[PDB]
């Protein structure tokens, strides 16, 4: 009788993940899969507007070059490795230091914000909406990671109890 309750509770934890995962994984997948639409909006803007240069500097932190180094960015963009470098900062494979640099700093400040970055540009606003949604799915894959680890632990305990 206990093992089958083990099995129901593991089913109830995956049901809680299941609510939030299919919309965020479609957005997080869409970028990763380098569709035409997504790439055109990325490959745009010679001079970013003011809030958007703040955003680019943060994208180049994800690149590795710490700031909106245009000449470096112009060169690496038109090279195949720029997106791989950046998408490696996705999911739970965003660093928790970067997630806290992002959250306590950038997304605790109006200057990097959807409001300000969508007024500043119609491309840049929805990139912030994908970037923050991907940064909250990133964070969710860290801080909702105890739910996934609980669904994992209920599976592992269930297998341990098969063998005992």
């Amino acid at each position: 009788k206990q093992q089958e309750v083990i099995a129901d509770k593991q089913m109830s934890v995956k049901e809680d993940l299941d609510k939030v995962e299919p919309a965020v994984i479609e957005a997080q997948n869409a970028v990763k899969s380098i569709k035409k639409q997504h790439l055109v909006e990325v490959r745009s803007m010679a001079n970013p507007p003011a809030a958007v240069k703040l955003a680019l500097e943060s994208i180049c932190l994800l690149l590795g070059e710490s700031t909106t180094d245009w000449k470096q960015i112009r060169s690496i963009i038109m090279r195949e490795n720029f997106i791989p470098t950046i998408v490696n900062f996705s999911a739970e494979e965003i660093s928790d230091a970067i997630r806290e640099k992002m959250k306590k700093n950038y997304m605790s400040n109006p200057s990097y914000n959807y409001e300000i970055v969508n007024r500043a540009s119609l491309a840049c606003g929805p990139m912030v909406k994908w970037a923050i949604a991907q940064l909250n799915y990133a964070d969710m894959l860290k801080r909702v990671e105890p739910l996934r680890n609980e669904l994992q632990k209920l599976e592992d305990d269930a297998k341990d109890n098969q063998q005992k």
Binding site: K71, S75, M78
Partner: protein, 427 residues
């Protein structure tokens, strides 16, 4: 002054290169051995356009004499305008012109990249005034195809930060049956689209058709036809550095060529004439200028945009003329091509004009077209391919000298994306 460097790639990029140098030096008062025949304004300011004055009114070139092998350098160093200055400007090194794009884009490209790059890095930092680089190219074999595409990837990695403007002569675009070569040649186009910022493509057969007809000679020597092109070019670069209210500069000119963000293809046309190089009557007035622009047949590159839309244009003039007779004529010749220039913008016009003639010319000009509804070009590469894709016994050379099939399918897709992007420009 502007202080331009010319990068001339392969034997074809040197052919045009050279048959520019004679004329450009000459009109700016540089004499064959580096002396002086100036005393007009451009042969005093403007003058250091590809040059510098030095050593008691002798002329060091800013565009130094570089070649690969010595007999070609013998023709450059005998000159006539290429003998100018003491030995430091003369450079040559290795050799090329091979086959197999894969060999040329890897193993047989990399040593020749290696021989080119060091002297470029040494020259490139050491030009202060340098407004930008002029580029000309060759599609000659595995070097000019394979290597030229390898090379530009290294040049643009090295220089994202410079202005590089690429003139390219082609055997009439993709007119001939092609074996398994379509999956290679799109991968060549792939590497051209991901490493080029401003492109201009010139049709050998159209200029020979222009030679048979307009210039009245049935023999089309392209070293002669590349002089005409270039001495016409003499009227363009220096036009916009002479004074005149429409002679625009960098940030404007950039968006004028790109109305829609992705990489464009510009085509030079022809402009005043009924002949040049035959007759004693060659045409030069405002009506005679408007006639070749608002025709169809003088323009380069067999892939016809013109049916699908007539898109954007510019004409760079030299010679005193009535500005409102230009715009009055322009109103009438535009009442021909109307909405259908692109019906989002009825009428596409741009011009630039300088008062002061070019050479023995009283008036001359050039014409520049852009590319919409030419998708036919990139159906055609696929339609030739079919036979010796099916009966293929030829892909394995390119592959066993370094290629592989994902790159071929990734290239194929951008040829179809091209078909779409012109379909979409016709829209």
């Amino acid at each position: 002054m502007r202080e331009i460097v010319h990068i001339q790639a392969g034997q074809c990029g040197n052919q045009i290169g050279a048959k520019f140098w004679e004329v450009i030096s000459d009109e700016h008062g540089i004499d064959p051995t580096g002396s002086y025949h100036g005393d007009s304004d451009l042969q005093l300011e403007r003058i250091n356009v590809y040059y510098n004055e030095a050593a008691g009114n002798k002329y060091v070139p800013r565009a130094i004499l570089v070649d690969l092998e010595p007999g070609t350098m013998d023709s450059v160093r005998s000159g006539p305008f290429g003998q100018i200055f003491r030995p430091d400007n003369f450079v040559f090194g290795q050799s090329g012109a091979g086959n197999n794009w894969a060999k040329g884009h890897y193993t047989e490209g990399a040593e020749l990249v290696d021989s080119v790059l060091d002297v470029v890095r040494k020259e490139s930092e050491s030009c202060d005034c340098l407004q930008g680089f002029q580029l000309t190219h060759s599609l000659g074999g595995g070097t000019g195809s394979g290597m030229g595409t390898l090379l530009i990837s290294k040049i643009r990695e090295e220089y994202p930060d410079r202005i590089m403007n690429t003139f390219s002569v082609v055997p009439s675009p993709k007119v001939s049956d092609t074996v398994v070569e379509p999956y290679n040649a799109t991968l060549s186009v792939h590497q051209l689209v991901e490493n080029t910022d401003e492109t201009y493509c010139i049709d050998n057969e159209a200029l020979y058709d222009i030679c048979f007809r307009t210039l009245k000679l049935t023999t089309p020597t392209y070293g002669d036809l590349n002089h005409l092109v270039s001495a016409t070019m003499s009227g363009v670069t220096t036009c916009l550095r002479f004074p005149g209210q429409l002679n625009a500069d960098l940030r404007k000119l950039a968006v004028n060529m790109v109305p829609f963000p992705r990489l464009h293809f510009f085509m030079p046309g022809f402009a005043p004439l009924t002949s040049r190089g035959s007759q004693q009557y060659r045409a030069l007035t405002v009506p005679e200028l408007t006639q070749q622009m608002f025709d169809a047949k003088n323009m380069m590159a067999a892939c016809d945009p013109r049916h699908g839309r007539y898109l954007t244009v510019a004409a760079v003039f030299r010679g005193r003329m009535s500005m409102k007779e230009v715009d009055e004529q322009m109103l009438n010749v535009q009442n021909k091509n109307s909405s259908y220039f692109v019906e989002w913008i009825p009428n596409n016009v741009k011009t630039a004009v300088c008062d002061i003639p070019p050479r023995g010319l009283k008036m001359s000009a050039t014409f520049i077209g852009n590319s919409t509804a030419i998708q036919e070009l990139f159906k055609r590469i696929s339609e030739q391919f079919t036979a010796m894709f099916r009966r293929k016994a030829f892909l394995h050379w390119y592959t066993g000298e370094g290629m592989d099939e994902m790159e071929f399918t990734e290239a194929e897709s951008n040829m179809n994306d091209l078909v779409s992007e012109y379909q979409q420009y016709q829209d």
